């Protein structure tokens, strides 16, 4: 699992304790925590396996960020804020909601100014409501001068070298994430390479390798929850998802100053520690390296995941309707391949 | 079913009787028998539905063909002859046998001269052996002068008009089929448009529309028995093939002078009547019309069959190995689309 909690310097006590972690049905083994100068860390990144780097200084300027500082300096732009009644903030793609009319999300998106977010958050705490908020917004040019300055002070030298060494594509975005204690982002995989930079508070990250596809049961590609697991971690339905009983995860708790490499196609479940206050994270999403000219057989798991996504997409467009994908695939396999 | 047997002219009695038909688990309704001048016959062909045409004169010159005439005139070329110990002559593609080493066929192919075929056939009858033979050979330029003459006398005017009216591609081949009484070609579909011209003896043809794909369980595309049904008609395994209990067929008995239109992708099971002597048939296989510029949704069943074949092919080549197609498809659908 996460292991013995780290001791904060100056004898300030344990950073967190196991009682701040939610309880799940599967075993986990810890993600390595290493210096960015450790050759083993380069070896993990090169091999597209997760690693927590403890001393990158990737977002050193931002470690002073809290709500007051951000409210004062982050500008007058609109911020996407998600609202839910449960701790689970399952992501949904708005463009695809037309395909499935029977999908009604359990979280709602609302655009607001930063001070409005701080206000709603302040308001909920005052009256101890159960509503939960999660701000997720990509950093853009509308931020104010001091945030620009902080952003410019990130460790571009280090990360640019990484981008170059791995042959990755361009940085596509930086997502600012601000959450309430207890918030969960359920298990999903992203199609970009991600350096997850923790800034404030603590997040437990549980990762699963691409080869566990069969255990995690993603939604259909056309569904709004494409790339998310259908399994409810709190109450797993083993009758529909029997192989979730075989899932094994790589887990860690990141705190201020840590950077977690989440390789492309790796599943990740991310939770802000219970009773840990608000969390702040900034991610760094890069397009993956181009497909190689020469393909080595047999293919890696993430290549097979890519093939399956493309089959699902092609069939949706060929049949003229994504709801026909399932019946055709079943008709294709029943009594033939199963 | 086939209906009341036809009465042969000059009061020569029933052409056949129901006791010459094998018994199967499913219901059937008869294929219409009509004149080629009947507008309903054009309407069936145009709509790619089967019809028996009784007066095309398509192979009128060949109606005098028997073994002695063919032996005397069909030349010194090699003829492919299949040999089996059962009545079922399941087709297998030799090129694909490398993909599945665990497939050992129940019929063997042997090349021989026509007189050798007649000899083996004569020999088996003399000693009442149980071996069965089925000659299946495409007509080629090596045939002798009188067969050329007969071939030239086929009703090209009529069939060429059909080829033109339907927009079909080229005639790809004429298959000569000579079988022993009781021989069965198990259910399969072909990817070409077929005019089946009966010459000698009687064959019961049972056809199933493309939309019955789900009931007939074809082998995987990479398997040597691609396009053949896995179901054993004599002993259907309803546990593996439950929807074979829903299959309904269109059936007819063709005799000398009849021509049966077997539309592309229609399943057909063909049996030479028990105790009916040898059968002779010549087929006429045409490439189907090009795919239309504008596609109408939803697609026809045979278009979906074409899509499924292409998915199976693409995955075989992408994974580098056809035996991985099944596991990927299952992993793609379990807990997702089923």
């Amino acid at each position: 699992g996460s292991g013995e909690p780290r001791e904060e310097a100056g004898a300030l006590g344990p950073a967190w304790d196991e009682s701040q972690l939610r309880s799940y049905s599967f075993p986990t083994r810890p993600i390595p925590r290493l210096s960015q100068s450790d050759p083993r860390a380069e070896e993990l990144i090169e091999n597209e396996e997760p690693v927590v780097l403890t001393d990158t200084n990737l977002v050193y300027p931002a470690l002073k960020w809290d709500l007051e500082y951000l409210q004062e300096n982050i500008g007058n732009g609109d911020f996407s804020v998600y609202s839910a009644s449960t701790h689970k903030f399952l992501y949904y793609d708005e463009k695809k909601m037309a395909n499935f009319q029977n999908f009604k999300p359990r979280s709602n998106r609302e655009e607001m100014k930063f001070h409005e977010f701080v206000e709603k958050l302040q308001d909920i705490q005052q009256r101890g409501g159960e509503e939960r908020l999660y701000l997720q917004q990509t950093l853009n040019d509308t931020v104010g001068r001091k945030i620009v300055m902080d952003f410019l002070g990130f460790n571009w030298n280090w990360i640019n070298k990484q981008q170059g060494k791995r042959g990755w594509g361009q940085l596509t975005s930086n997502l600012l994430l601000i959450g309430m204690e207890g918030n969960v982002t359920p298990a999903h995989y992203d199609e970009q390479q991600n350096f997850f930079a923790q800034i404030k508070g603590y997040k437990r990250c549980i990762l699963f390798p691409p080869d566990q596809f069969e255990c995690l049961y993603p939604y259909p590609v056309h569904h709004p929850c494409d790339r998310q697991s259908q399994v409810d971690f709190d109450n797993p339905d083993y009758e529909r998802f029997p192989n979730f009983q075989n899932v094994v995860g790589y887990e860690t708790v990141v705190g201020p100053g840590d950077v977690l490499y989440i390789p492309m196609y790796w599943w990740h479940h991310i939770e802000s520690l219970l009773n840990g206050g608000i969390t702040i994270t900034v991610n760094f999403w890069y397009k993956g390296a181009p497909t190689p000219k020469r393909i080595e057989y047999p293919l890696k798991a993430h290549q097979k995941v890519a093939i399956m996504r493309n089959i699902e997409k092609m069939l949706g467009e060929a049949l003229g309707n994504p709801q026909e994908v399932g019946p055709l695939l079943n008709t294709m396999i029943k009594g033939r391949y199963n | 079913g086939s209906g009341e047997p036809r009465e042969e002219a000059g009061a020569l009695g029933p052409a056949w009787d129901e006791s010459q038909l094998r018994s199967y688990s499913f219901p059937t309704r008869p294929i219409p028998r009509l004149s080629q001048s009947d507008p309903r016959a054009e309407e069936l062909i145009e709509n790619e539905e089967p019809v028996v045409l009784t007066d095309t004169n398509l192979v009128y010159p060949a109606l005098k063909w028997d073994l002695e005439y063919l032996q005397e005139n069909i030349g010194n070329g090699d003829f492919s002859v299949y040999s089996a110990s059962t009545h079922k002559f399941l087709y297998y593609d030799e090129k694909k046998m490398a993909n599945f080493q665990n497939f050992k066929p129940r019929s063997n192919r042997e090349e021989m001269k026509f007189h050798e075929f007649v000899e083996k056939l004569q020999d088996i009858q003399q000693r009442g052996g149980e071996e069965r033979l089925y000659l299946q050979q495409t007509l080629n330029d090596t045939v002798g002068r009188k067969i050329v003459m007969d071939f030239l006398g086929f009703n090209w005017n009529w069939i060429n008009k059909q080829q033109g009216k339907r927009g079909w591609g080229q005639l790809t081949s004429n298959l000569l089929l000579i079988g022993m009484e009781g021989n069965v070609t198990p259910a399969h579909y072909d990817e070409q448009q077929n005019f089946f011209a009966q010459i000698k003896g009687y064959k019961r043809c049972i056809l199933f529309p493309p939309d019955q794909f789900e009931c007939l369980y074809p082998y995987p595309v990479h398997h040597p028995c691609d396009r053949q049904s896995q179901v054993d008609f004599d002993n259907p395994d309803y546990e593996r093939f439950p929807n074979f209990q829903n299959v309904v067929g269109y059936e007819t008995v063709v005799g000398p002078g009849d021509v049966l239109y077997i539309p592309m992708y229609w399943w057909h099971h063909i049996e030479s009547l028990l105790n009916g002597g040898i059968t002779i048939t010549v087929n006429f296989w045409y490439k189907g019309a090009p795919t239309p510029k504008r596609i109408e949704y939803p697609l026809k069943a045979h278009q979906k069959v074409a899509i499924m074949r292409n998915i199976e092919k693409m995955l075989g080549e992408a994974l580098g190995n056809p035996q991985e197609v099944g596991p990927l498809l299952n992993t793609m659908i379990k807990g997702r689309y089923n």
Partner: peptide
Amino acid sequence: KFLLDFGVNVNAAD
């Protein structure tokens, strides 16, 4: 070939 191609979809709006 075409099948191996990947996108850039993540848990955020394009």
